[PDB]
Amino acid sequence: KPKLRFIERAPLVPKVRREPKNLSDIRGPSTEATEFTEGNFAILALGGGYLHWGHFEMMRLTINRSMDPKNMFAIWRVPAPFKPITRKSVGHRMGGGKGAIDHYVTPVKAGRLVVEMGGRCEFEEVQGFLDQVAHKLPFAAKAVSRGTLEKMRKDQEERERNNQNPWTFERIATANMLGIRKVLSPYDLTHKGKYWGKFYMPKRV
Amino acid sequence: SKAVTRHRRVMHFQRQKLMAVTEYIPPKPAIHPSCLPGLIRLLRREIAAVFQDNRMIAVCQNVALSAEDKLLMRHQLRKHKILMKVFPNQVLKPFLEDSKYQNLLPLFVGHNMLLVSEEPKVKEMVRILRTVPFLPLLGGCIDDTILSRQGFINYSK
């Protein structure tokens, strides 16, 4: 089946427990689904965020509209919406516990591949609708091939090797140079200044 | 505010100072680097077979015709076995210098169109090119002797 399968609004088994918005599932680099597997093209996430069901439906409709099933196949990498986001009743005051579950959400960290293309397909013919659907995405994304992923990784290594500035974020953060971990996060010892909140800085070494 | 916000959260000023000091500095060289210092073989042996085939070559400026006019002239010169050929001069100038054609070097530039043959019917091309009021006769060369139009007419008559 060389098409995007239907993504449900909620899993078949419900989640009766309200879960806190642990926002650290957005922040930082991805560790799941960061490298290609038996595919050729993807929409790399240059930043984290929440994907709702409307985003999933819009991506599926946009990919399957300009679609060639005899030449291309596409596989989901982001799973079904499982995180419950709760909203209180409209125009009502605080207290009274946590609100009822409103909608189900997937969290995506930076560096995550969302969907995979494959087949007898080339770069320029797929950047069109991939750039369209990536501009329609909530977070910053980019149509990235196998060659372009390694190309930007080589770019990151040559930027971190060729710099003439003796002071990098990793040195100042790890050595606690100016007593300046007072204004840094403990996550900055592993983010090394490339991550600030939910965002990602590609141009920053 | 939370650590994760929808907008880009403003930083502590010492954090901004650390980010501005630790910016990437690209290496600047002392001198700028930008201010420093089978088809062709098919053309080769095809046109070489053409040189070793004919004993004169003729050429004109046949792009002043429509496609049906090309078909008509191709049929009118298909009655005899004269070959009409088009190939670029960027490779034909080496074809001229390889074929020891020194006096044919300022002859094949621009749009040029070969009319190679082994026995002359050239009066027929003469009154084809006189029944239309254009399309002149660019000079040729029979057995390492150059021919202008006066030479063409002298050889035609």
């Binding site: 002071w167 100042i172 140079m177 100016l178 | 100072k17 650390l18 501005a20 000091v21």
Partner: peptide, 28 residues
Amino acid sequence: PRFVSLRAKQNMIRRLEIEAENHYWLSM
């Protein structure tokens, strides 16, 4: 909003050089 000037950067650089001195002399 507050921005970073050249004086702030150079003062930061000088403090970092002093700290690099302190790092070297604490290693022996």
